[PDB]
Amino acid sequence: KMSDVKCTSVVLLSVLQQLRVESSSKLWAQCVQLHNDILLAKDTTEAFEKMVSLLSVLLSMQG
């Protein structure tokens, strides 16, 4: 059931790339660093904090 967190994260990063927010590089380095931190996890609630942070990111911008 924790592969669903990874597939939702990779389809949201696929959304967030074509929103064209790559040029502001300072948030983009942190977002790709936390995406790399998502895929190498073993506990769920820490990963749940990571994905609700990424949903806060993709509901934050109006791109």
Partner: peptide, 30 residues
């Protein structure tokens, strides 16, 4: 998502076992 959507329909992708995934794509900066 079509392959994963039909992949859960054959009783697969549980926990409690090794029915999961390891490898993924990765992304790099400028």
């Amino acid at each position: 998502k079509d392959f994963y959507d039909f992949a859960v329909s054959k009783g697969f992708f549980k926990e409690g076992s090794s029915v999961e995934l390891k490898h993924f794509f990765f992304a790099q900066d400028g």
